[PDB]
């Protein structure tokens, strides 16, 4: 997961990363609202070094939810997972 | 600059082909010093005291001969024994001596964190102390391989001459310092 | 600088900033929480 | 749990090899403990119900077995040899919860 | 091999597991002994309230 | 480009659901509806791996399926992640393909199966004894090496070092101390955590005392636990031996236990000196059990001042006056023949050789 990038021009993220962390993770508390993205995640195209290509949590809906808590675990598989509990 | 403390060699290992035609059998018969075991193995082996050095002669005219400390003594011994085997009745010649193999060891006289070295080296630095104590180290220029102890002794082994351990050590040194 | 979670009992601040297993200093929980927002927000009283 | 492992396990207690006999295995005693998780450095901490849900993993705990076997000799015993995991049932005897 | 083996390097973990875990998570419980296939024995709690 | 514009500001948008390219610029469509999958075929898809699609897997030699399920069944029978198999498996394939491991014999085979295992747990940073994979596999411990050295060497790939910890980690939980089993006096219970603690900081303070280097760290973990076991209640435990504490643990206690046991306690002494306390009460090797915590709670400072008196191996530690003395030049080979009889009497005559031809008859 990469960080929020952001814009030259006005030196603060794009609107489409607006509530992601420094972390590249959303924030708790914060409003999301439709077509943002809740996790900047990107994969490598191994399917001379692996291009990475980018595959975004989106946030689908017809209304902006608020965002209660956001959890974070690893499995015995060194997996890391990652739950978002939204609100309206 | 060096710490006073040059590289020892300990083994030199040498051959030659002797252009002729043997009898092991005839040759563990007529010497005092000759060993063949064709149920073990079909070559004769060959030792004398001066120079201290083992060697083997074959049926198909080759020799074999090592534990000298210097490649003049490994030479002087390889032609101590054609000598003996010119005059137990073989028709043997010098020719194509080489030089294959030496041996020599060295010390830092301070402890060495070997744990630091495998961290720092591991790309060639092959450590593993479960089954062997000694780290091993394989460097490039030239070809050797090392193997290197706590107590600060090394171990060079796979050159040619001399001053390929010597500048092998002059390399390794400041690396073993720090 | 780092980001700093929350555990999952003792709830003393803990600190990753790398692929380490998510296992907590002090107890050997294995869950965590972003802490809340920097930012403000602003509600309707209705 | 209580006493169906059991009557399984005595009616299919012993087994053996027909080619080279007087070569065979017994089983014991049978048990299934209490819930735990494999951390990955092998070793176990009992986990409640709650942990589960959240991290997506089972609640279960793990079967084990005493067998008996020969191998030139026949004195060779194991005491807890482990055989795999059973789901448990929330608040029975052997739940943490209970 | 002529050294006599023994069992204890076959003990192998992870049928059991399989045939119990998955057995319960899909809710079908295939059983050659009898000839018999049952679905639908096994449902999701509903935690509407 | 934009058609209209020749500009390159397209940016995909979607519409409430019409998913299309816009030229943000000037406003005009050039790519617009997609075509997807259903959920209907969705429950009837299947998989082919691409090898087999390729027509692969029919070339896999019985013992090479053989030995690729050796290596599925030996990591299952650890209850492991399947990601360690499936990378094992992974790489007991890519060891295949060289012609000097296709051609060898069966034990070969099987130390490959081990070490590849091995490297794979290592990689991943697990901890495991080199002893019990060899316990799980037919073959000999010092064939096992032979042919580890010979693949680490052939691929030259990574070998992570065996972290102390973790594998202290490991052992630890091994033992049946901490449970009032029947076999075993309730005497003998305490705490796991503080138990792993004290093992931990010893285990450390040995690691920096330079006595892990090189040598096995089996034993001293356990002597570790021994002391720390015993330093937990001195009061009863100091009357207990090495042997009784493996008998009570059912553990197989290496030979050289003991010997590393005595190295910690010199080095114990050593630290001891340093404490006023300590050095006043002329303390020695079976009374200082007490004071092993007083001892690693100060540890950093007393071990930094202790050291400026390192440690080697005991061996030559004896004062060595002389180390690597210069032997003498003799590097002449003289000129053609320096002596000449040494041929005579290394010969034989003809007696001895016909002692020699009924030598073996
Ligand atoms: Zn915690
Ligand atoms: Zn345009």
């Known amino acids: 997961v990469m960080g929020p990038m952001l814009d030259a021009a006005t030196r603060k993220p794009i609107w489409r990363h607006e509530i992601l962390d420094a972390d590249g993770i959303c924030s708790p508390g914060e409003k999301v609202e439709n077509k943002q993205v809740l996790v900047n995640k990107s994969m490598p195209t191994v399917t001379q070094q692996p291009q990475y290509k980018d595959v975004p949590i989106t946030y689908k809906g017809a209304t902006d939810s608020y965002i209660e808590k956001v959890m974070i675990s690893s499995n015995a598989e060194d997996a890391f997972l990652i739950k978002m509990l939204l609100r309206q | 600059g060096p710490s006073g403390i040059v590289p020892q060699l300990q083994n030199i290992v040498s051959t030659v082909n002797l252009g002729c035609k043997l009898d092991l059998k005839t040759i563990a018969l007529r010497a005092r010093n000759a060993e063949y075991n064709p149920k073990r193995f079909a070559a004769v082996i060959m030792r004398i005291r001066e120079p201290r050095t083992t060697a083997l002669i074959f049926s198909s005219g080759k020799m074999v001969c090592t534990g000298a400390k210097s490649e003049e003594q490994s030479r002087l011994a390889a032609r101590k024994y054609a000598r003996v085997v010119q005059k137990l009745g073989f028709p043997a010649k010098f020719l194509?001596?080489?030089?294959?193999?030496?041996?020599?060891?060295?010390?830092?006289?301070?402890?060495?964190?070997?744990?630091?070295?495998?961290?720092?080296?591991?790309?060639?630095?092959?450590?593993?102390?479960?089954?062997?104590?000694?780290?091993?180290?394989?460097?490039?220029?030239?070809?050797?391989?090392?193997?290197?102890?706590?107590?600060?002794?090394?171990?060079?082994?796979?050159?040619?001459?001399?001053?390929?351990?010597?500048?092998?050590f002059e390399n390794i040194y400041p690396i073993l310092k720090g | 600088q780092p980001m700093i979670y929350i555990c999952g009992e003792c709830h003393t601040e803990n600190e990753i900033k790398s692929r380490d297993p998510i296992r907590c200093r002090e107890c050997g929980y294995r869950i965590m929480y972003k802490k809340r927002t920097k930012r403000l927000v602003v509600f309707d009283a209705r | 749990?209580?006493?169906?492992?059991?009557?399984?396990?005595?009616?299919?207690?012993?087994?053996?090899?027909?080619?080279?006999?007087?070569?065979?295995?017994?089983?014991?005693?049978?048990?299934?403990?209490?819930?735990?998780?494999?951390?990955?450095?092998?070793?176990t901490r009992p986990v409640s119900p709650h942990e589960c849900r959240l991290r997506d993993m089972t609640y279960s705990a793990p079967i084990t077995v005493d067998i008996e076997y020969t191998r030139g000799s026949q004195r060779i015993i194991r005491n807890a040899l482990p055989i795999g995991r059973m789901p448990i049932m929330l608040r029975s005897s052997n739940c943490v919860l209970t | 091999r002529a050294a006599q083996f023994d069992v204890v390097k076959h003990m192998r973990q992870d049928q059991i597991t399989n045939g119990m875990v998955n057995a319960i998570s899909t809710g079908n419980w295939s059983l050659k002994r009898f000839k018999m296939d049952r679905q639908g024995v096994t449902q999701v709690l509903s935690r509407l309230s | 480009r934009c058609p209209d514009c020749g500009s390159t500001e397209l940016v995909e948008d979607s519409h409430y659901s019409q998913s299309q390219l816009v030229c943000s610029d000037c406003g005009c469509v050039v790519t617009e509806g997609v075509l997807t999958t259903t959920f209907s075929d969705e429950g009837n898809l299947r998989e082919v791996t691409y090898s087999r699609s390729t027509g692969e897997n029919e070339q896999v030699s019985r013992s090479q399926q053989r030995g690729l399920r050796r290596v599925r069944d030996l990591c299952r029978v650890l209850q492991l992640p399947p990601t360690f198999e499936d990378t094992a498996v992974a790489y007991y394939q890519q060891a295949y393909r060289h012609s000097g491991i296709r051609a060898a014999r069966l034990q070969k085979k099987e130390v490959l199966v081990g070490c590849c295992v091995l490297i794979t747990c290592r990689q991943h940073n697990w901890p495991l004894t080199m002893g019990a994979i060899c316990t799980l596999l037919y073959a000999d411990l010092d064939v096992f090496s032979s042919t580890y050295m010979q693949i680490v060497k052939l691929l030259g790939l990574d070998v992570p070092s065996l972290c102390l910890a973790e594998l202290v980690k490991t052992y630890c939980s091994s033992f049946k101390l901490f449970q009032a089993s029947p076999s075993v006096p309730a005497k003998y219970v305490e705490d796991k955590e503080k138990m792993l603690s004290r093992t931990?900081?010893?285990?450390?303070?040995?690691?920096?005392?330079?006595?892990?280097?090189?040598?096995?760290?089996?034993?001293?973990?356990?002597?570790?636990?021994?002391?720390?076991?015993?330093?937990?209640?001195?009061?009863?435990?100091?009357?207990?031996?090495?042997?009784?504490?493996?008998?009570?643990?059912?553990?197989?206690?290496?030979?050289?236990?003991?010997?590393?046991?005595?190295?910690?306690?010199?080095?114990?002494?050593?630290?001891?000196?340093?404490?006023?306390?300590?050095?006043?009460?002329?303390?020695?090797?079976?009374?200082?059990?007490?004071?092993?915590?007083?001892?690693?709670?100060?540890?950093?400072?007393?071990?930094?001042?202790?050291?400026?008196?390192?440690?080697?191996?005991?061996?030559?530690?004896?004062?060595?006056?002389?180390?690597?003395?210069?032997?003498?030049?003799?590097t002449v080979t003289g000129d053609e023949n320096i002596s000449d009889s040494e041929i005579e009497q290394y010969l034989r005559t003809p007696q001895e050789v016909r002692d020699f031809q009924r030598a073996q008859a």
Not at chain 2, 103 to 126: A, Y
Not at chain 4, 1 to 20: F, G, L, Q, R, Y
């Open chain 2, 96 to 168: 194509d001596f080489k030089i294959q193999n030496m041996v020599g060891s060295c010390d830092v006289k301070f402890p060495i964190r070997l744990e630091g070295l495998v961290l720092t080296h591991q790309q060639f630095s092959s450590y593993e102390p479960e089954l062997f104590p000694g780290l091993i180290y394989r460097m490039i220029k030239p070809r050797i391989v090392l193997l290197i102890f706590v107590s600060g002794k090394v171990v060079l082994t796979g050159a040619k001459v001399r001053a390929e351990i010597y500048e092998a």
């Open chain 4, 1 to 43: 749990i209580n006493v169906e492992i059991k009557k399984i396990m005595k009616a299919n207690e012993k087994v053996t090899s027909d080619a080279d006999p007087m070569w065979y295995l017994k089983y014991l005693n049978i048990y299934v403990g209490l819930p735990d998780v494999e951390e990955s450095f092998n070793v």
């Open chain 6, 200 to 330: 931990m900081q010893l285990v450390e303070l040995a690691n920096e005392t330079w006595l892990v280097t090189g040598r096995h760290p089996l034993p001293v973990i356990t002597a570790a636990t021994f002391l720390a076991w015993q330093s937990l209640q001195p009061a009863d435990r100091l009357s207990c031996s090495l042997a009784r504490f493996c008998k009570l643990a059912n553990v197989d206690l290496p030979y050289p236990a003991s010997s590393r046991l005595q190295e910690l306690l010199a080095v114990l002494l050593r630290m001891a000196e340093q404490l006023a306390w300590l050095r006043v009460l002329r303390l020695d090797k079976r009374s200082v059990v007490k004071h092993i915590g007083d001892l690693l709670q100060h540890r950093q400072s007393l071990v930094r001042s202790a050291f400026r008196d390192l440690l080697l191996p005991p061996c030559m530690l004896k004062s060595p006056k002389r180390i690597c003395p210069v032997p003498p030049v003799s």
